[PDB]
């Protein structure tokens, strides 16, 4: 034992002078006298990483870790050689064990893994019914259905298009699936074929559905085609949304030119002004939308929301109250108000407003706010929760929301984070992975894939009794120290 230490120190001398071959020779000498010492194997791996033999690093760190599984230098070296070799999951596992005895190394490996899995996964599906009802909420449903021209002598596809629009504007689960289906059919039929006006209408709505399905290129193609056939406010609005400031506002002026009295033109432009912090022009556009369609709840909602974002909560609350008196049965009112209240930190009143909205949504024949209230209440309850009643209540609401609107990535992500918190990790992974498929942008997809890949490491850590015990002890100690 003692002579083996002397030999290791001789090896250390050769290591310091960058004579790695002589160092390994002395460390192996030490192993021949005392093979139960992890440091000897660990020291050999330092020689192999300095020369660049990553495969041997893994061999010798592993031999160290087979003796002493918490050996910090051998864990760090093994993770380094694993990362270099592209074994990110293996690196993440060693770094997690090390973290229990680094954080940017773990994150780097997670991001390398998530990026890898997303690319493999990448080499037709509608958004949630809730999102669809929200998107189409501003439109005058009678006007849109009635916009189909029946006076043609050659159009054999008008009646199918009429049906597609009726089903779309029914604002139902089945209606959106049927509309998507019949709209694609109509577009094919119009390509084969008042007719030009109907063709542009079919292409316009098929175009926006492509935008909503995340087919941005297919959206622009059918929309520009629609404009070429018979330009309408809708087609310019829809193309401007597909391409989202200078160009956006150019398209909206073209929309304005075609019909200065079309309410959704000013609503959608007001939304852009709102996002761009131009509160003056946003207000003026929402007021234009309201005057042109005083029966639509959404312009009122946005004017109230504007008052809040400008720091006038009292005036906002009063505007919401005034809106309540005009629209007493519409869940949109308490839903957006509950969003304001949550943001203001008033969780008690937000829950009450979400309860009202849930009740109003249940009695409506059409979808208005969908699962919005369920997500909203559950997110508050989960945040308010050691409080097992509120946590399990949040689980029940999000499970219900996932069941009612299966294509909602928001609901799945919400439920998964909670499943993960209660160590239902397999369930969390599945939910995260389904959320990645449903996710829209590249960053949202990578985000959901990142959650899944991180969750799989947690699963792997939890499967080991010793690591699992260590993890639980860490949490227990943290809570006790608090």
């Amino acid at each position: 034992q003692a002579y083996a230490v002397q030999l290791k120190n001789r090896g250390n001398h050769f290591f310091t002078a960058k004579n790695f071959n002589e160092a390994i020779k002395y460390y192996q000498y030490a192993i021949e006298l005392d093979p139960n010492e992890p440091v000897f194997y660990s020291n050999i791996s330092a020689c192999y990483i300095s020369t660049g033999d990553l495969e041997k690093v893994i061999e010798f760190t592993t031999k160290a870790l087979e003796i002493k599984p918490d050996h910090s230098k051998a864990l760090l070296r093994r993770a380094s050689a694993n990362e270099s070799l592209g074994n990110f999951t293996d690196a993440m596992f060693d770094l997690s064990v090390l973290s229990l005895n680094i954080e940017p190394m773990l994150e780097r490996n997670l991001n390398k893994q998530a990026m890898k899995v997303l690319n493999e996964n990448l080499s037709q599906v509608l958004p949630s019914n809730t999102s669809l009802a929200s998107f189409f909420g501003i439109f005058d449903s009678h006007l849109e259905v009635s916009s189909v021209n029946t006076s043609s002598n050659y159009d054999t596809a008008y009646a199918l298009l009429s049906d597609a629009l009726q089903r779309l504007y029914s604002a139902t689960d089945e209606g959106y699936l049927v509309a998507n289906d019949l709209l694609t059919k109509s577009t094919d039929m119009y390509h084969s074929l008042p007719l030009r006006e109907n063709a542009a209408l079919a292409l316009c709505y098929t175009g926006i559905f492509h935008f909503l399905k995340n087919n941005l290129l297919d959206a622009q193609v059918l929309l520009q085609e629609s404009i070429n056939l018979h330009p309408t406010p809708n087609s310019y609005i829809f193309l401007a949304l597909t391409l989202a400031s200078q160009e956006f506002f150019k398209f909206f002026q073209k929309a304005v030119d075609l019909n200065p009295e079309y309410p959704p033109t000013y609503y959608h432009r007001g939304q852009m002004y709102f996002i761009l912090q131009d509160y003056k022009n946003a207000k003026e556009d929402f007021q234009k939308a309201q005057s042109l369609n005083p029966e639509n709840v959404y312009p009122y909602i946005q004017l109230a929301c504007l008052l809040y974002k400008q720091g006038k909560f009292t005036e906002s609350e009063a505007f919401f109250n005034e809106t309540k008196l005009k629209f007493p049965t519409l869940p949109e009112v308490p839903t957006f108000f509950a969003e304001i209240l949550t943001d203001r930190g008033d969780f008690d009143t937000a829950i009450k407003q979400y309860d009202i909205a849930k009740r109003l949504e249940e009695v409506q024949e059409k979808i208005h706010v969908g699962i919005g209230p369920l997500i909203g209440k559950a997110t508050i309850l989960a945040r308010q929760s050691l409080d097992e009643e509120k946590f399990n209540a949040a689980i029940k609401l999000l499970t219900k929301a996932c069941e009612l609107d299966p294509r909602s990535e928001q609901a799945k992500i919400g439920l998964a984070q909670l499943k993960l918190q209660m160590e239902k990790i397999d369930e969390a992974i599945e939910l995260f992975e389904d959320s990645a498929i449903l996710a829209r942008t590249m960053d949202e997809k990578l985000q959901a894939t990142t959650f899944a890949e991180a969750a799989k490491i947690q699963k792997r850590l939890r499967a080991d009794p010793i690591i699992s015990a260590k993890m639980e002890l860490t949490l227990a100690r943290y809570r006790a120290k608090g």
Partner: peptide
């Protein structure tokens, strides 16, 4: 980088 470092040896024990």
């Amino acid at each position: 980088e470092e040896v024990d």
